[PDB]
Structure 1
Amino acid sequence: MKQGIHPEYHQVIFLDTTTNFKFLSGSTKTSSEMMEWEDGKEYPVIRLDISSDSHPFYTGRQKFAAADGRVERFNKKFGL
């Protein structure tokens, strides 16, 4: 790489806060908070709302049951 043209870039820990799932990768975010890695050296941590281990599509988790059919809604509404 050439010198002085590329932005500052360094290893960070992306931390999915929902599942408290850490994984190390490079990025230019430069977040202040530091959390120790399995390796001794700490690196800045990036808080993550969602991730591959927390997304319903990735995990297959079904948040809500499928919509009832018309016959089923008729029956459950009218008690028959």
Structure 2
Amino acid sequence: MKQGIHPEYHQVIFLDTTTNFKFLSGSTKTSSEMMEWEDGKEYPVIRLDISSDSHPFYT
């Protein structure tokens, strides 16, 4: 955590429309688009996610 070259970080609720994977990370501690508490109050509009939903290992 190179404090001195460390901007913000957090466990972002990057919820999807498929599988609702709001257990993610980023720099945008987002608004309460999904004003929820099962996941953080972050934007759930990030729907394109295949590694759990439609991936080469499992479509």
Instruction: Give the TM-score band, short-chain normalised.
Output: 0.3 to 0.5
Q: Give ranges in structure 1 of 5+ residues lacking alignment.
A: 60-80
DSSP-derived class of the 1:48 partner: coil
**TM-align CA RMSD:** 4.1
- The alpha-carbon deviation at position 5 of structure 1 amounts to 1.5
Q: Identity of counterpart residues, as a percentage?
A: 100
Structure 1 outlier segments of 4+, above 6 Å: 39-45
Seen in structure 2, the aligned counterparts of structure 1 residues 22 and 9 have a Cα distance that, compared at 3 Å, is closer
Where relative contact order (Cα < 8 A, 6+ residues apart) is larger, the structure is 2
Structure with higher strand content: 1
Q: Give ranges in structure 2 of 5+ residues lacking alignment.
A: none
The number of equivalent residue pairs is 59
